[PDB]
Amino acid sequence: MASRILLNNGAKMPILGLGTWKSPPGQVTEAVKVAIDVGYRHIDCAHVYQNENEVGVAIQEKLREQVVKREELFIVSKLWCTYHEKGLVKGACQKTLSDLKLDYLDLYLIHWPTGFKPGKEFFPLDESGNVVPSDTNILDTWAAMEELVDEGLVKAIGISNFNHLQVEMILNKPGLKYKPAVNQIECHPYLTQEKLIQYCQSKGIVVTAYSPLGSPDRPWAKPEDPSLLEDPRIKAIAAKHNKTTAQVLIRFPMQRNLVVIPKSVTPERIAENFKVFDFELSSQDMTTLLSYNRNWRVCALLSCTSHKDYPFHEEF
Numbered sequence: 001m002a003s004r005i006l007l008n009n010g011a012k013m014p015i016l017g018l019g020t021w022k023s024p025p026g027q028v029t030e031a032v033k034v035a036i037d038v039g040y041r042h043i044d045c046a047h048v049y050q051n052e053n054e055v056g057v058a059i060q061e062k063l064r065e066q067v068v069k070r071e072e073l074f075i076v077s078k079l080w081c082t083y084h085e086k087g088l089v090k091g092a093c094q095k096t097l098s099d100l101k102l103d104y105l106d107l108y109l110i111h112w113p114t115g116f117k118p119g120k121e122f123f124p125l126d127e128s129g130n131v132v133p134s135d136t137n138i139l140d141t142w143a144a145m146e147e148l149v150d151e152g153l154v155k156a157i158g159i160s161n162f163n164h165l166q167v168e169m170i171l172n173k174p175g176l177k178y179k180p181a182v183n184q185i186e187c188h189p190y191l192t193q194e195k196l197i198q199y200c201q202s203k204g205i206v207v208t209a210y211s212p213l214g215s216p217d218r219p220w221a222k223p224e225d226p227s228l229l230e231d232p233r234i235k236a237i238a239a240k241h242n243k244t245t246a247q248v249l250i251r252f253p254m255q256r257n258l259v260v261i262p263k264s265v266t267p268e269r270i271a272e273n274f275k276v277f278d279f280e281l282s283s284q285d286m287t288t289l290l291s292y293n294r295n296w297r298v299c300a301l302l303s304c305t306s307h308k309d310y311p312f313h314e315e316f
């Protein structure tokens, strides 16, 4: 299987990338350096992760060392919810570029479909704990994203955590100039996303699977939640293939024509997670993994559920 997938902007995107949410700032520079040394060419970033400066130090050092050329890297970041306004989008993108020490992003995503009140706080709340919305809509935010392409700041634009109706809304936007290249969504054997993936793929939108290992380090994990990495059924498939459970969990979305972005700051795991291009899951393995769906989400947040554009009320 090829290492890159063709996007609807004509560029190629590496199907395996390194995730950086929760990567501590004192560890992420080495994580990214190691990743690039062992073959990663795609890094998934976001302003809200609060570590773009440190990710950027690694990228810049590897470019300066001539380990890789800029054209060989595929750097992704995301517009946070408090920057959905027309007059804030460019500055948000530019802050990310400055922190990452780049002159362009390969892909810039609307991080969530919901706009929040601008200000210092990433999750502005009212006194009862509800997020404070902005009156921005996804269509006007999309137009602002299109301007970034036309100004040379980003090569591609896309969306993240958009449900099927929201993807459709973008595709049906009056005067749409650029289709979204990517929809980045949670996807793993407990949340298999067959409906949304089929819709996006049918429209030429590439899907990126986040939390492919079930995000065991998510800060709201409870001791009782289901655990992909410990699931004996998945362990059995891994054992049959002489691979680790994580390697199976990474190969799974690859064979569905998805991009996948496992996170690690452990050098041995960063390397392990990349060694997924030399084995194949059978069709029966794939269907078996799909069968584990339980509609379980890592990524959801009660405080945001009443926002008009909160994505997880719809079935898909």
Ligand SMILES: NC(=O)c1ccc[n+]([C@@H]2O[C@H](COP(=O)([O-])OP(=O)(O)OC[C@H]3O[C@@H](n4cnc5c(N)ncnc54)[C@H](OP(=O)(O)O)[C@@H]3O)[C@@H](O)[C@H]2O)c1
Pocket: 018, 019, 020, 021, 022, 044, 045, 111, 160, 161, 184, 185, 209, 210, 211, 212, 213, 214, 215, 216, 217, 218, 229, 244, 246, 247, 261, 262, 263, 264, 265, 266, 269, 270, 272, 273, 298, 299
């Ligand atoms: N667009 C969005 O809204 C959104 C939401 C969530 C995530 N994402 C992106 O997707 C990335 C991945 O998702 P995620 O960070 O939620 O979780 P994940 O990649 O599913 O899991 C990361 C966890 O798995 C551990 N791990 C990694 N490789 C392992 C291996 N080979 N064996 C055992 N454990 C392993 C990591 O530990 P160590 O790091 O300690 O090694 C870490 O605790 C994020 O970092 C972010 O870039 C985007």
Ligand SMILES: O=C(O)COc1cc(Cl)ccc1C(=O)NCc1ccc(I)cc1
Pocket: 021, 046, 048, 049, 050, 112, 113, 114, 299, 300, 301, 304, 310
């Ligand atoms: O959004 C991500 O990429 C990962 O999740 C996070 C990352 C940070 Cl750095 C802070 C908070 C979250 C989080 O709470 N995510 C769940 C979440 C769900 C719906 C909405 I609208 C907003 C957030």
